[PDB]
Amino acid sequence: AWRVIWRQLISSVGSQARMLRRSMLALLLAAFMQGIAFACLYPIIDALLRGDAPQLLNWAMAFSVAAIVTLVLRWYGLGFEYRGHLAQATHELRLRLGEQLRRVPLEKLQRGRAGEMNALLLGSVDENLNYVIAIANILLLTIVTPLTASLATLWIDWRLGLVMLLIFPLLVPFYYWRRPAMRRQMQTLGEAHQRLSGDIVEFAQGMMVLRTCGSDADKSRALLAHFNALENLQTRTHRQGAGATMLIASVVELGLQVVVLSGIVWVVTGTLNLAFLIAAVAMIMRFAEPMAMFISYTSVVELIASALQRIEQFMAIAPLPVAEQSEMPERYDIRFDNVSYRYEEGDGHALNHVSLTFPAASMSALVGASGAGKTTVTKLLMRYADPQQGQISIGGVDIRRLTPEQLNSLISVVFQDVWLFDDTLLANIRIARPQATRQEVEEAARAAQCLEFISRLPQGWLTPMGEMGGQLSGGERQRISIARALLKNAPVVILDEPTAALDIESELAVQKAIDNLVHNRTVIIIAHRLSTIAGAGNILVMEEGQVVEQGTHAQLLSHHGRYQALWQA
Amino acid sequence: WQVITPVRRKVILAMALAGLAALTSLGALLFLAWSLRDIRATPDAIPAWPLGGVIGCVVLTFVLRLQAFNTSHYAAFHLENILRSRLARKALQLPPGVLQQMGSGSVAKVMLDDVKSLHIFVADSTPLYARAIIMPLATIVILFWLDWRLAIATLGVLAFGSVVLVLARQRSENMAQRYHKAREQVSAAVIEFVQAMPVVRTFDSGSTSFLRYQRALEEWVDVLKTWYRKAGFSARFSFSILNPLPTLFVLIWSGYGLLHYGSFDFIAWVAVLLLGSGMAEAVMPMMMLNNLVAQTRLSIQRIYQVLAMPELSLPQSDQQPQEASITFEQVSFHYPQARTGAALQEVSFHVPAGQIVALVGPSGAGKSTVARLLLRYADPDKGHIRIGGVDLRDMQTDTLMKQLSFVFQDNFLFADTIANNIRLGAPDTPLEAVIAAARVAQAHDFISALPEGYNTRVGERGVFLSGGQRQRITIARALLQDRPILVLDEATAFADPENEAALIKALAAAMRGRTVIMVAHRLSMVTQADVILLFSDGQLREMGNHTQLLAQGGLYQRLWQHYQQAQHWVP
Ligand SMILES: CC(C)(C1=N[C@@](C)(C(=O)O)CS1)[C@H](O)[C@@H]1CS[C@H]([C@H]2CSC(c3ccccc3O)=N2)N1
Ligand SMILES: [Fe+3]
């Protein structure tokens, strides 16, 4: 709709609502007073084909007065944008988007698989809101200025007024009356364009297997046939949509011709409107430039509408309910009581009906045959999502009674890291505790054995790592992440599968670092390798989203996939 | 430049058609002045001929501008198709290393967005640029012919707006580049921030990454605000003096000054009015033109980069196929400076037919570069690699791909769902052969348990295939093709237990009777091999069997002692 765009625009600008309303008023009065100057163009020419120097003076003075006023008012209306008040508007919008992205539940952030790149794309494309004053200047001119010029020529004449009013100021509604046909045909074009982009992605990735199957020439011919099919669809669409596009582009001249013919018909017959025809033609010839600007800007109008709709949809999701937030426990016995969480509604009950106990100061293991399953519980412990039924508890206190801050500083997770964000590695260790000094960073690096490799690495702990963050093995990346989780003295540590990279460096250094970290700590190792799991003290087997046999190692030796799981190693 | 136009016969045509369309629109306005003179001279008889001239020049202008847009858009679509065709024929012969690097975010992005921006340049803008040349270069002549005294005012106001806008553009000459630099830097900060959100959420409050993003945002804000100030105190004046209203304000008072001391003719005034109207909306697409042509020049320079980038792998088909051997001869290869894979200083080793060769490496790059270089990702600098007696530098690319049958870690799969995805080597699918090739260790049960059978859609929009089953699919493909040299990288790559046992049984089926050069990391498959080679920092250090290296006392017994200890968790 067109009122919801105004509400979303006056909200999502931010604290510049007063300045935006003032500039909208300035631009409306500017377009209106320019239309009144265009009406003052009428008796100028009527005096001008006669002698009438006093009449020309007494109306050109009013034209100067009503020209300077609307030029100053347009100067202020764009001085909304050119003093700089739009930079503060999009700045406040982006800093509200940042806090909303820091406050969003991670469940919507991750289950939005397309929503990930959607949120990233909107947060990066929000500089497209820069067009909002140059579009509220053009649209408002094209609707108001012919409407007020025509509502004045209703007072100068009768029939030239109606011919001007029915044609020219209703041109922007006559474009949005014919718009959804163009939107449907642009959708038909964009769908095939996206399918071609997907086929190009598929070609570019699978080039190598396409070459070693020997069928590279066949898929090259298939892509050339797809290119010719896209060009033929582009020609077939454009050939049947060029009439409307050319009519809309030249509608101001094809409406000028109606006024020229009808006005000459009225001039030659006895209703001698004298030179008001000449002044009306000189008026509605100058509606060419804002209409030609608006048909250039309509695609930006649609992008601004979609961006504001996506922003008001994105800032409407709320963080988790936090009842009685003052508590924080000290009895870290993690307990689950009938948790059933639906990851996606297509495969419901992904983590179905569990009841876990991870006792304090020990290691408790999770094992399963899927990547998810036993990692969804390690997501749920980080307040990724609310359990649909049941309670999750760090001790006697449920997790829903804690803040996101106390929980996100209570536990520490280690997984396969793709990070360090191209800067100093002292901060990349100290980001888990900015209140930790230089003497504790070296203590954690010595206790997590990344110290020898980072001293072997150049630049001597300055270490910019600017070559996309990765110029080293993933095994010492894992040692960096282990030192990061070791710096933050978290009493509950969630381990992913932290051992998948190499044989000597990665495996031995990460084993040396991890066996330091488990000491008077409730730790959850979820690695698939049943040897490291076999060393543990409590075993949980996750079999298709539901635990089946919880016990010690001998309980796994009771009845299981025992002989195969111990034979494969 | 304009060098990428081989369609210039159909763009010069659209240019001249839009130029003549603008010239006949000027003719229509001139005929309107003619008809108003005829209706003022004798205001009782309807003007008949020059009003017919008005409607004729209007319908001629509309038909000519319609044919101008039709020719321009057909030319743009033909340029887009021929440019994507030349890009595809070039990217067929790219070396797959640089093509795999651009396959992340560049070559598909350039093959779409380059030619799309080229369409929005040469379709919807060059007839406008022709109109913006033709109209203010003929309307000055018409204005000067119609009045000596009156064209000076409208020309002075349009030249005033032109010099003010050019002066505003000249003050922003570096600040526009600084704004684009700030925008690319702050979009990079947005990229790393949205990628950073889960891990910085779970490691702290997010305050460090939020500050590292807010500082780049505030830098961009200060850049944009000082650009808006320093440009806008003249740009508001430029936008407000290109309005029709100051041209009207100089025109009305110039008419008064002409009427005040005589020699003023009304028809010559209303001609200057309509033509001085018609100049500005034609000259405004020249105000948008530099803004468009900057991004167009960026896109054309990007496509001239991609069309002439590589060394093109040195194709040589001037040899015959031999069989079953594999020989490295003092070869040397290092990657480009921004790439994976450390180096290979000097390696030389010869393997006859029927030996299973395990490369064991602590690096992950010293042992991957040998397999990637055997599959002709690039060419070695100083050395020779020979399958059989014949060098692979002179190997027919049909024969070389008939010799080697490869598997890797990432292992892409197509939308040919399964029975054409396994049988992708042959153009046709003998289906029962694909059944027999999927009868190996665990392709058949994974396919048969799927809901849609052997045509269960994998594709870009289908099943995840759980990672390891994609590797089982391409193992079935590599066993279907039965090419004599099989190249591994995935010997127990993914540590799912039943998938480990299944992949070991499938690889025991697939390695049987082939010269297999296998690059493993877990040594459980390496300990059953023929000639095991060790790779430390791009140099060959070891040779010989499993037991002979272990008795040698070299690097291999230390790397074996490391592995058997690290299998046990506690120490
Ligand atoms: C986004 C924006 C509205 C655009 N402007 C266009 C019209 C331009 O090509 O400028 C292309 S998208 C801004 O204005 C940007 C900000 S940085 C530059 C400034 C420097 S001074 C100036 C200007 C001066 C006179 C008349 C109009 C102007 O816009 N624009 N453009
Ligand atoms: Fe601008």
CATH number at residue A485: 3.40.50.300
Find residue A495's DSSP bridge partners: A414, A525
**Which residues of chain A have a CB within 8 Å of the CB of B202?**
382, 408, 412-413
Q: Where are the beta strands (DSSP E) in A320-362?
A: 334-341, 351-354, 357-358
Contact yes or no for B357/B327 (Cβ under 8 A): no
Coil, helix or strand at residue B339: coil
Contact yes or no for B284/A293 (Cβ under 8 A): yes
In the PDB record, what is the listed experimental method? cryo-EM
Residues A106 and A195 in one domain: yes
Contact yes or no for A354/A336 (Cβ under 8 A): yes
Residues A51 and A117 in one domain: yes
Tokens 């340049």 sit on residue: B121
Distance of CA B145 to the CA centre of its chain: 52
Which residue owns the Cα nearest ligand 1 atom 29?
Answer: B235
Cβ of residue B231 lying under 6 Å from some atom of ligand 1: yes
Domain's final residue, options A286, A315, A344: A315
Measure the CA–CA gap between B281 and A292, rounded to whole angstroms: 8
Measure the CA–CA gap between B332 and A190, rounded to whole angstroms: 48
Closest Cβ–Cβ partner in A124, A207, A213 for B99: A207
Nearest by Cα to B323 from B124, B483, B126: B483
Nearest by Cα to A284 from A301, A259, A319, A311: A259
Half-sphere exposure of B383 (CA within 13 A, CB side): 23
Measure the CA–CA gap between B248 and A289, rounded to whole angstroms: 15
CB pairs < 8 Å spanning A and B: 369
Measure the CA–CA gap between B140 and B278, rounded to whole angstroms: 11
Measure the CA–CA gap between B96 and B167, rounded to whole angstroms: 49
Measure the CA–CA gap between A183 and A463, rounded to whole angstroms: 52
Asked whether residue A322 is assigned to any structural domain, the reply reads: no
Coil, helix or strand at residue A339: strand
Measure the CA–CA gap between B300 and B113, rounded to whole angstroms: 11
Residues B291 and B353 in one domain: no
Domain's final residue, options B273, B294, B319: B319
State whether B198 and A110 contact (CB < 8 Å): yes
Contact yes or no for B279/B244 (Cβ under 8 A): no
Nearest by Cα to A213 from B474, B319, B385: B474
Query: Both tokens of residue B84?
Result: 């994507």
The pair phi, psi for residue A305, each rounded to 5°, is -65, -45
Measure the CA–CA gap between B91 and B306, rounded to whole angstroms: 9
* Residue B544 burial class via C-beta count within 10 angstroms: exposed 0-12, middle 13-18, buried 19 and up: middle
Top mutation candidate among B291, B295, B296 for ligand 1, by most atoms within 8 Å of CB: B291
Residues B190 and B243 in one domain: yes
For residue A481, give the amino acid letter: S
For residue A443, give the amino acid letter: E
C-alpha distance from residue A128 to each of A304, A452, A527, B283 (Å) = 7, 48, 46, 25
Query: Both tokens of residue B462?
Result: 């289908």
Measure the CA–CA gap between A182 and A242, rounded to whole angstroms: 11
Determine how β-strand A389-394 pairs with β-strand A397-398.
antiparallel
Contact yes or no for B132/B290 (Cβ under 8 A): no
Query: Both tokens of residue A4?
Result: 């919801």
Residues B438 and B522 in one domain: yes
State whether B245 and A37 contact (CB < 8 Å): yes
Least Cα separation, residue A494 to chain B (angstroms):
11
The three state secondary structure string of B285-325 is HHCCHHHHHHHHHHHHHHHHHHHCCCCCCCCCCCCCCCCCC
Tokens 């028809």 sit on residue: B267
- State in Å, rounded, how far the first CA of chain B is from the last one: 67
CATH code for the domain in which residue B527 is found:
3.40.50.300
Distance of CA A183 to the CA centre of its chain: 22
Measure the CA–CA gap between A357 and A393, rounded to whole angstroms: 10
Angle made by CA atoms B330, B336, B338, in degrees to the nearest 5: 140
Asked whether residue A25 is assigned to any structural domain, the reply reads: yes
Tokens 């796994």 sit on residue: A556
C-alpha distance from residue B252 to each of A275, B157, B246, B285, B458 (Å) = 15, 13, 10, 27, 73
Measure the CA–CA gap between A314 and A304, rounded to whole angstroms: 15
Nearest by Cα to A283 from A74, A78, A43, A53: A43
Query: Both tokens of residue A145?
Result: 């200025």
Contact with chain A for residue B73, Cβ under 8 A: yes
Residues A42 and A95 in one domain: yes
What is the whole-number distance in angstroms between the Cα of residue A45 and the centre of ligand 1? 36
Q: What is the DSSP letter of A550?
A: E
Contact yes or no for A348/A329 (Cβ under 8 A): no
Half-sphere exposure of B481 (CA within 13 A, CB side): 28
Angle made by CA atoms A493, A541, A370, in degrees to the nearest 5: 85
Residues B259 and B110 in one domain: yes
Query: Both tokens of residue A415?
Result: 């997984």
What contacts B58, CB < 8 A, 6 or more positions away?
A: A253, A254, A257, B25, B28
Q: What is the DSSP letter of A467?
A: T
Residues A178 and A239 in one domain: yes
State whether A212 and B44 contact (CB < 8 Å): no
Residues A139 and A236 in one domain: yes
Query: Both tokens of residue B548?
Result: 């002979």
State whether A204 and B406 contact (CB < 8 Å): no
Residues B285 and B324 in one domain: no
Residues A524 and A564 in one domain: yes
Find residue B328's DSSP bridge partners: B349, B385
Cβ of residue B560 lying under 6 Å from some atom of ligand 1: no
Top mutation candidate among B164, B169, B237 for ligand 1, by most atoms within 8 Å of CB: B169
Partner A, chain B 476-535, Cβ-Cβ below 8 Å: 477, 481, 495-498, 500-501, 521-523
Query: Both tokens of residue A515?
Result: 């066996």
Q: Provide the number of structural domains found in chain A.
A: 2
Residues A243 and A300 in one domain: yes
* Residue A395 burial class via C-beta count within 10 angstroms: exposed 0-12, middle 13-18, buried 19 and up: middle
Tokens 């948008």 sit on residue: B288
Residues A444 and A356 in one domain: yes
Contact yes or no for B257/A49 (Cβ under 8 A): no
Q: Where are the beta strands (DSSP E) in B513-561?
A: 515-519, 531-536, 539-540
Coil, helix or strand at residue A391: strand
| B453-456, Cβ contacts within 8 angstroms, sequence gap of 24 or more | B454/B418, B454/B419, B455/B417, B455/B418, B455/B419, B456/B417, B456/B418
Q: What is the DSSP letter of B47?
A: P
Contact yes or no for A140/A27 (Cβ under 8 A): yes
Alpha helix stretches (DSSP H) within B46-150: 49-91, 96-105, 107-122, 126-146
Distance of CA A87 to the CA centre of its chain: 19
Find residue B349's DSSP bridge partners: B328
Angle made by CA atoms A334, A340, A345, in degrees to the nearest 5: 140
Domain's final residue, options A315, A346, A375: A315
Query: Both tokens of residue B398?
Result: 């049909």
The percent of chain B in helix, strand and coil, each rounded to the nearest 5, is 60, 10, 30
Ligand nearest to the backbone CA of B287? 1
The pair phi, psi for residue B488, each rounded to 5°, is -100, 160
Residues B263 and B350 in one domain: no
Measure the CA–CA gap between A233 and A220, rounded to whole angstroms: 20
CATH code for the domain in which residue A52 is found:
1.20.1560.10
Measure the CA–CA gap between B239 and B169, rounded to whole angstroms: 12
Which residue owns the Cα nearest ligand 1 atom 15?
Answer: B228
Measure the CA–CA gap between A491 and A411, rounded to whole angstroms: 6
Nearest by Cα to A469 from B184, B203, B196: B196
Contact yes or no for B240/A74 (Cβ under 8 A): yes
Torsion B256-B258-B264-B269 (CA) sign: negative
Determine how β-strand B357-360 pairs with β-strand A547-551.
unpaired
Query: Both tokens of residue A407?
Result: 């929980």
For residue A473, give the amino acid letter: S
Distance of CA B72 to the CA centre of its chain: 24
Question: Quick one: angle between helices A288-314 and A251-268, nearest 10?
Answer: 140
Nearest by Cα to A527 from A517, A540, A516: A540
Torsion A306-A311-A312-A317 (CA) sign: positive
C-alpha distance from residue A475 to each of B25, B176, B330 (Å) = 72, 44, 31
What contacts B338, CB < 8 A, 6 or more positions away?
A: A467
Cβ of residue B235 lying under 6 Å from some atom of ligand 1: yes
What is the whole-number distance in angstroms between the Cα of residue B295 and the centre of ligand 1? 15
The percent of chain A in helix, strand and coil, each rounded to the nearest 5, is 60, 10, 30
**Which residues of chain A have a CB within 8 Å of the CB of B122?**
none
Asked whether residue A323 is assigned to any structural domain, the reply reads: no
Nearest by Cα to B405 from B526, B517, B521, B531: B517
Q: How many helices (H) and strands (E) does chain A have?
A: 27, 11
State whether A422 and B405 contact (CB < 8 Å): no
Cβ of residue B292 lying under 6 Å from some atom of ligand 1: no
C-alpha distance from residue B27 to each of B20, B131, B154 (Å) = 10, 14, 19
State whether B246 and A292 contact (CB < 8 Å): no
**Which residues of chain A have a CB within 8 Å of the CB of B196?**
419, 421
Q: Provide the number of structural domains found in chain B.
A: 2
Domain's final residue, options B319, B334, B353: B319
B191, closest residue in chain A (CA to CA): A120
Residues B311 and B328 in one domain: no
Cβ of residue B162 lying under 6 Å from some atom of ligand 1: no
What is the whole-number distance in angstroms between the Cα of residue B239 and the centre of ligand 2? 10
Domain's final residue, options B291, B319, B347: B319
Residues A342 and A244 in one domain: no
Tokens 């090259």 sit on residue: A220
Residues B324 and B313 in one domain: no
Contact yes or no for B250/B154 (Cβ under 8 A): yes
Measure the CA–CA gap between B211 and B213, rounded to whole angstroms: 5
Q: How many CB atoms lie within 10 A of CB B428?
A: 7
Cβ of residue B239 lying under 6 Å from some atom of ligand 1: yes
Contact yes or no for A533/A525 (Cβ under 8 A): yes
Residues A344 and A292 in one domain: no
CA dihedral B458, B463, B464, B467 (to 10 degrees): -50
Residues B309 and B378 in one domain: no
Torsion B512-B517-B522-B528 (CA) sign: positive
Domain that holds residue A347: 334-568
What is the whole-number distance in angstroms between the Cα of residue A12 and the centre of ligand 2? 22
Tokens 């603008």 sit on residue: B22
What contacts A20, CB < 8 A, 6 or more positions away?
A: A9, A10, A13, A80, A89
Measure the CA–CA gap between A480 and A465, rounded to whole angstroms: 13
Contact yes or no for B511/B484 (Cβ under 8 A): no
Torsion B53-B57-B60-B62 (CA) sign: negative
Determine how β-strand A363-368 pairs with β-strand A522-525.
parallel
Half-sphere exposure of B293 (CA within 13 A, CB side): 12
Asked whether residue A249 is assigned to any structural domain, the reply reads: yes
Measure the CA–CA gap between A541 and A543, rounded to whole angstroms: 6
**Which residues of chain A have a CB within 8 Å of the CB of B221?**
87-88, 91
Measure the CA–CA gap between A31 and A522, rounded to whole angstroms: 70
Ligand nearest to the backbone CA of B236? 1
Find residue A551's DSSP bridge partners: A539
Q: What is the DSSP letter of B92?
A: T
Angle made by CA atoms A19, A23, A28, in degrees to the nearest 5: 150
DSSP string, A177-238: SSHHHHHHHHHHHHHHHHHHHHHHHHHHHTHHHHHHTT-HHHHHHHHHHHHHHHHHHHHHHH
Domain that holds residue B330: 320-571
Measure the CA–CA gap between B468 and B447, rounded to whole angstroms: 13
State whether B204 and A51 contact (CB < 8 Å): no
Residues B147 and B5 in one domain: yes
Query: Both tokens of residue A425?
Result: 């590695």
Measure the CA–CA gap between A514 and A447, rounded to whole angstroms: 9
Measure the CA–CA gap between B397 and B401, rounded to whole angstroms: 6
Q: How many CB atoms lie within 10 A of CB A116?
A: 15
For residue A428, give the amino acid letter: N
Residues A190 and A100 in one domain: yes
Query: Both tokens of residue B25?
Result: 């629109």
Q: Which residues of A36-48 are buried (b: 16+ CB within 10 A; e: fewer)?
A: bbbbbbbbbbbbb
Q: What is the DSSP letter of B454?
A: G
Measure the CA–CA gap between A340 and A350, rounded to whole angstroms: 8
Residues A225 and A370 in one domain: no
State whether A124 and B460 contact (CB < 8 Å): no
Measure the CA–CA gap between A428 and A431, rounded to whole angstroms: 6
Partner A, chain B 404-433, Cβ-Cβ below 8 Å: 404-406, 411-415, 424-425, 427
Distance of CA A21 to the CA centre of its chain: 27
Asked whether residue A324 is assigned to any structural domain, the reply reads: no
The pair phi, psi for residue A524, each rounded to 5°, is -125, 105
DSSP string, A136-178: HTHHHHHHHHHHHHHHHHHHH-SHHHHHHHHHSTTHHHHHHSS
